Amino acid sequence: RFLKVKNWETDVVLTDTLHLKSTLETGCTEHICMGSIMLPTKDQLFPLAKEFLDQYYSSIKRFGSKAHMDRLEEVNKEIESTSTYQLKDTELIYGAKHAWRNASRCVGRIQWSKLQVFDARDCTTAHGMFNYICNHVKYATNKGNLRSAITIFPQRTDGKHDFRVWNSQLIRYAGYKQPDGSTLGDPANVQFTEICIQQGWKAPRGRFDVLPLLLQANGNDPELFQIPPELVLEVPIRHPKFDWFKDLGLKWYGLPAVSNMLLEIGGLEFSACPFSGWYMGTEIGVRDYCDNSRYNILEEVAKKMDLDMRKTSSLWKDQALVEINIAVLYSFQSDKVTIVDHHSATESFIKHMENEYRCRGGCPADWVWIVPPMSGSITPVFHQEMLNYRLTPSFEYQPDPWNTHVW
Amino acid sequence: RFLKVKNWETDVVLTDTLHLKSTLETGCTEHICMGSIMLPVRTKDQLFPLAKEFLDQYYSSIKRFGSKAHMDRLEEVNKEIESTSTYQLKDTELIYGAKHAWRNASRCVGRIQWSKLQVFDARDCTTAHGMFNYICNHVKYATNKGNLRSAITIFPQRTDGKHDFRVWNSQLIRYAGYKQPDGSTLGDPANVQFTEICIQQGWKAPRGRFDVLPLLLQANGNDPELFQIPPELVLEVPIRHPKFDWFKDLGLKWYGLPAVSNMLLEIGGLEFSACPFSGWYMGTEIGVRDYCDNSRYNILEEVAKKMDLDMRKTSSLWKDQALVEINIAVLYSFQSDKVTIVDHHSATESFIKHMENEYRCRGGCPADWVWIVPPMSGSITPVFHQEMLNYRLTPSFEYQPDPWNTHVWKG
Numbered sequence: 078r079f080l081k082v083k084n085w086e087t088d089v090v091l092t093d094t095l096h097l098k099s100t101l102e103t104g105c106t107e108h109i110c111m112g113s114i115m116l117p118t119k120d121q122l123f124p125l126a127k128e129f130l131d132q133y134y135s136s137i138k139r140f141g142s143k144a145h146m147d148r149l150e151e152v153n154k155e156i157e158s159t160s161t162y163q164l165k166d167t168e169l170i171y172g173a174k175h176a177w178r179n180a181s182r183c184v185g186r187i188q189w190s191k192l193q194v195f196d197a198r199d200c201t202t203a204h205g206m207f208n209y210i211c212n213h214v215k216y217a218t219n220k221g222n223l224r225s226a227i228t229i230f231p232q233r234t235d236g237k238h239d240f241r242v243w244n245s246q247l248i249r250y251a252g253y254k255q256p257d258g259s260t261l262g263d264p265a266n267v268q269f270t271e272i273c274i275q276q277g278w279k280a281p282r283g284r285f286d287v288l289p290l291l292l293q294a295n296g297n298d299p300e301l302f303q304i305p306p307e308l309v310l311e312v313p314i315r316h317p318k319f320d321w322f323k324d325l326g327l328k329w330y331g332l333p334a335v336s337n338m339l340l341e342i343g344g345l346e347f348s349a350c351p352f353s354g355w356y357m358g359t360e361i362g363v364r365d366y367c368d369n370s371r372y373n374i375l376e377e378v379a380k381k382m383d384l385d386m387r388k389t390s391s392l393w394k395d396q397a398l399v400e401i402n403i404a405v406l407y408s409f410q411s412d413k414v415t416i417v418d419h420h421s422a423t424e425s426f427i428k429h430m431e432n433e434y435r436c437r438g439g440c441p442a443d444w445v446w447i448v449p450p451m452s453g454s455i456t457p458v459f460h461q462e463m464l465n466y467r468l469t470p471s472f473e474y475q476p477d478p479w480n481t482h483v484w
Numbered sequence: 485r486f487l488k489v490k491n492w493e494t495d496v497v498l499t500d501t502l503h504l505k506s507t508l509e510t511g512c513t514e515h516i517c518m519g520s521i522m523l524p525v526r527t528k529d530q531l532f533p534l535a536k537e538f539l540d541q542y543y544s545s546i547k548r549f550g551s552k553a554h555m556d557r558l559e560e561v562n563k564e565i566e567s568t569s570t571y572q573l574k575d576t577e578l579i580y581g582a583k584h585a586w587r588n589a590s591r592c593v594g595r596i597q598w599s600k601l602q603v604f605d606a607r608d609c610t611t612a613h614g615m616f617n618y619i620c621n622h623v624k625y626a627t628n629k630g631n632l633r634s635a636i637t638i639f640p641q642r643t644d645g646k647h648d649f650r651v652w653n654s655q656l657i658r659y660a661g662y663k664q665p666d667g668s669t670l671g672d673p674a675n676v677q678f679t680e681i682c683i684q685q686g687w688k689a690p691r692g693r694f695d696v697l698p699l700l701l702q703a704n705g706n707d708p709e710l711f712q713i714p715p716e717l718v719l720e721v722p723i724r725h726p727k728f729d730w731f732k733d734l735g736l737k738w739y740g741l742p743a744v745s746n747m748l749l750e751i752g753g754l755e756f757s758a759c760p761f762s763g764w765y766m767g768t769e770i771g772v773r774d775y776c777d778n779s780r781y782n783i784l785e786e787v788a789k790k791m792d793l794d795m796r797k798t799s800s801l802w803k804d805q806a807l808v809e810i811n812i813a814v815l816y817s818f819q820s821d822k823v824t825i826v827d828h829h830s831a832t833e834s835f836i837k838h839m840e841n842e843y844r845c846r847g848g849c850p851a852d853w854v855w856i857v858p859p860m861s862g863s864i865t866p867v868f869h870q871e872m873l874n875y876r877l878t879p880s881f882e883y884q885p886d887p888w889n890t891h892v893w894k895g
C-alpha cells in the first residue's frame with residue numbers, strides 16, 4: 078500500500094503515498110501490463126465536486142472551515158437545482174494548474190505552478206473562440222520568450238452543445254496526398270487537412286502550410302479562421318557547422334499548443350481548453366523530423382553528410398539524428414525562441430520529482446513518455462523508477478470531433 | 485478475450501489471445517502501473533498442477549496431446565511427486581522448457597533465436613569443481629572462436645531449498661571493480677560488492693581496470709568455492725574506432741560472451757537456481773550502458789574531450805555525439821575481430837518480425853517495452869513505435885535474491 082521507487086544510478090529511494098488518492102483506472106491488471114499502449118448525472122457529479130473542493134480547501138489551509146462547508150453546501154444546491162455547477166475563478170485556476178501537475182506524460186511539470194489561465198467561459202461563438210485563441214497565441218509566444226498558458230472555454234452541459242477546437246494543436250502544418258503517391262507536408266495531418274478543404278479552406282499545397290483553425294462553439298458546426306500570419310512565430314532550421322543544412326528548406330513553429338484534449342475539474346468537463354508551453358528539442362528533431370510517418374528526413378540528411386548508408390551498423394541514422402537535433406536547438410537559440418534540450422529538461426524533472434515526493438508524497442509519471450526518444454540512458458530519467466497512476470484534475474484524451482459531431 | 489496492439493508507424497494491428505494462458509502476476513493493478521519498476525520449497529499440493537500444465541503444453545507442442553504416452557507421463561509424474569515430493573524432467577522436456585523460458589522472456593529483444601539454443605544438461609553435477617568444469621565447457625562451446633552460439637547449462641534443481649546450486653557471479657565473465665580510499669572506483673563499479681566477496685574468499689586481485697573475475701560456485705548448498713576461468717577461454721575485444729586513431733589509446737576492451745548466471749529457471753514448478761545462459765551482445769549494451777552510464781565506466785567526458793566537442797553547455801549535444809562515436813567503435817571492433825555482435829537497428833527490426841510471427845502462430849508475444857527499446861536512438865528503431873503487452877508465461881527466467889544475502893555459512 079505504501080510504495081517505493083528507486084533510482085538505479087544514484088540509489089536514492091523515494092516512498093509514494095499519493096497513489097492511494099488515485100481515482101481513475103490505468104488499463105493494467107494483475108495479469109497484464111498495458112504501460113506501452115497509447116490509449117488504454119447528478120448522483121455522479123456531487124462526489125466528484127466534493128472530492129475536488131476538499132482538495133482545494135485543503136490547499137489553502139481552510140479544510141473543515143465554515144467557508145469550506147458553505148461552498149460545499151452551495152455547490153450541492155446548484156447541482157440539485159441545475160444538474161451542474163460553476164467553478165469560482167480561484168478553483169478554475171487551481172484546477173488547471175493541478176491537471177498539469179497530474180499529467181503523468183509531461184516531463185515539463187517543474188513549471189506547473191507558473192501557468193497563465195485565460196478564463197474564456199463567457200465565449201459564445203466561434204468568432205469569440207478565434208479572438209481568444211489569437212490572444213493566447215500572442216501572449217504565450219511573447220516575441221519568443223515563451224510563457225505557459227491555457228485558455229478555457231465553456232464546460233460541457235448536455236453534451237450536445239460542446240465547444241471544441243478541431244485542430245490537434247493550434248499551430249500545425251498541412252498534409253496532402255499526392256497524385257505521385259507520396260505525401261506533401263506533414264503526413265500526420267492528412268485527414269484534418271481534407272476536412273479543412275471540404276469545409277472550404279483554399280490550400281496553398283506547400284510543405285509547411287500553417288493549418289486554419291476549425292472552431293466549434295456551443296455544439297454548432299465548426300467554422301474556419303486563419304491565425305494572423307504575424308502571430309505565428311516560425312524558425313528556419315540551420316546547423317552551426319553544416320552550411321548545406323539550410324538548403325534542406327526546413328522550418329518549424331515556436332509554439333507547441335495542444336488543443337484536442339479535455340480538462341476535467343471537479344467532475345466538470347472542458348472539451349475545449351488549448352494549452353501551451355515550449356518545446357523540448359527532440360519533439361521536433363527526433364519525432365517530427367525523423368519518424369518515418371512524419372517528415373522522415375534521415376535519409377536526405379545522411380546523404381548530405383556522405384555517411385556510409387550501406388549497413389545499419391555504421392550507425393548512420395544515429396549520426397544524422399544527433400546533427401538534426403543539434404540544428405534544431407541551435408536555430409531556436411539563435412532566433413531567441415525558448416527551447417529546452419532533453420538533458421536539461423530531464424534533469425529538471427528529476428528535481429521536480431524529488432520536490433513532489435517530499436512535499437506531496439509522490440508524482441505520477443509515465444516512464445515510456447518521459448524518457449526522451451533519443452539517448453534514453455544518458456538522461457537521468459531512464460534510471461528512475463516511476464509509478465504511473467491517474468489523479469484528478471486531469472487532461473484526458475477525447476475522440477476526434479468529426480466522428481462524434483452531427484452536422 | 486482479445487487484446488489489440490497497434491504499431492503507430494505502420495498502423496499494423498495485432499490481436500493477442502496468448503495473455504489468457506498467463507498465470508503469474510505483473511505488479512500492476514487497475515490503479516497503478518509498475519511497468520518501469522526493475523524488480524516488481526513448494527508443496528505436493530501446488531506442484532502437480534504446475535507439472536500438469538507444463539506437460540500438457542509439452543505434449544501439445546509435439547502433437548501428442550491426450551495420447552497414451554501423454555497420460556502415462558502424467559501418471560508417472562503424479563506418482564513420483566506423491567512418493568518423493570518432486571519429479572525429474574526427461575531430457576526432451578528440459579530442452580523444451582529451457583527454450584520456452586527464453587521464448588517467454590518479455591525483456592529479451594533477441595528472441596527470434598529462441599528455437600536455436602544449445603542445452604547442456606548438468607543435472608548429474610554434484611560439486612563446485614564439477615560446476616567449474618561444466619562452465620568452462622559452456623564458455624568454450626558458446627564462444628566458438630568468436631562465432632557465438634546460444635547456450636544454457638542447467639545444474640540440479642532445488643529440493644528443500646537448503647541444497648541449492650548457485651553461481652554467485654551475476655555473469656560468467658565480468659570485470660572486477662575496486663573502491664579506492666579516495667572514493668573513486670577502479671574497474672567496473674557494478675561489481676565492487678561481488679569483487680569484495682571474492683577477495684574475502686581469497687582471490688588475489690590484480691587491481692587493474694579490466695580484471696576478469698573468478699567464478700564463485702556453490703554446489704548442493706555448500707559454501708562457495710573460487711575458480712579462475714582459464715584465460716585462453718576468455719575472448720576479449722580491444723576497442724578502436726574506424727576513423728579516430730586516438731580511440732585505441734583510451735585503453736578500452738570488452739569480453740565477447742555475455743552470460744547471465746544469477747537467474748532462476750522455472751519449468752513445471754521445478755526451480756533451477758543455477759542455469760547460466762549466454763547469447764551474443766547487442767552493441768548498445770556495451771557502448772551505451774557499460775561504457776556510458778554514470779555508475780559504470782562513465783567514459784563520455786574523456787571521449788568528448790578528445791573529440792574537442794563544446795562541453796560548456798548540454799545543448800551542443802556533446803554527450804549524444806560522443807555516445808554515437810563510442811557505439812560505432814564497439815560495433816567496428818567486434819566486427820573487425822569477427823566476434824558476433826548485433827547493432828540495435830538490426831536487432832529491433834528482427835524483433836518486430838519475430839513478434840508478428842509470434843502473434844500469427846502463437847496468439848501473442850509478451851514484451852516489456854521499457855526493456856526492449858534500446859538506450860540510445862529509441863524512436864528511430866521500430867520497437868519504440870510498437871505497442872506491446874507484458875505478461876508472464878511459464879516456463880520462465882526469474883530474478884532471485886543475491887546468494888550472499890541468503891546463504892547459511894557452514895564454515
Ligand code: HEM
Pocket residue numbers: 177180182183184185186188192225226227335352353354355356357360417422446472
Ligand atoms: C513549459 C514547458 C513544457 C515542456 C518542456 C513540456 C514537455 C512535454 C513533453 C516533451 C511532452 C511529450 C509530448 C509528446 O511526445 O508528444 C509533454 C506532454 C504533455 N504535457 Fe507538457 N510540457 C510543457 C508544458 C505543458 C503545459 C503548460 C501543460 C498543461 C497546462 C502540459 C501538459 C501536458 C500533457 C497533458 C501531455 C501529454 C500530451 C499527450 O498525451 O499527447 N505541458 N510535455
Ligand code: HEM
Pocket residue numbers: 582586589591592593594595597601634635636744761762763764765766769826831855881
Ligand atoms: C542470441 C542473442 C541474444 C541477444 C542479442 C539478446 C538481447 C538481449 C538484451 C539486449 C537484453 C537486455 C540486457 C540488459 O539490458 O541487461 C536481454 C535480456 C534478456 N535475455 Fe536476451 N538476448 C540474446 C539471447 C538470450 C538467450 C540465449 C537467453 C536465454 C536462453 C536470453 C534471455 C534473456 C533474459 C531472461 C533477459 C532479461 C534479463 C534481465 O532481466 O536481466 N537471451 N537480451
Ligand SMILES: C[C@H](O)[C@H](O)[C@H]1CNc2nc(N)[nH]c(=O)c2N1
Pocket residue numbers: 112113114115445446447492868869870871872
Ligand atoms: C507504442 C508507444 O507507446 C508509443 O510509440 C509512444 C512511446 N513513447 C512516447 N513518448 C512520447 N513522449 N511521445 C510519444 O508520442 C510516444 N510514443
Ligand SMILES: C[C@H](O)[C@H](O)[C@H]1CNc2nc(N)[nH]c(=O)c2N1
Pocket residue numbers: 085459460461462463519520521522854855856
Ligand atoms: C527504472 C528503469 O526501469 C530501468 O532503468 C531500466 C529501463 N530499461 C532497461 N532496459 C534494459 N534493456 N536494461 C536495463 O537495465 C534497463 N533499465
Ligand SMILES: CCCSCC(=N)NCCC[C@H](N)C(=O)O
Pocket residue numbers: 333334335352353354355356357360361364365
Ligand atoms: C502543448 C503543451 C503540452 S506540452 C508542450 C510541448 N512541449 N509539446 C507538446 C506536444 C508537441 C508535439 N510533440 C510536437 O512535437 O509538435
Ligand SMILES: CCCSCC(=N)NCCC[C@H](N)C(=O)O
Pocket residue numbers: 655742743744761762763764765766769770773774
Ligand atoms: C546472457 C544471455 C541473456 S541476454 C544476452 C545479452 N545479449 N546480454 C546479456 C546481458 C549483458 C549486459 N547487458 C552487459 O552489458 O554485460
Ligand SMILES: [Zn+2]
Pocket residue numbers: 105106109110111112512516517518519
Ligand atoms: Zn502496467
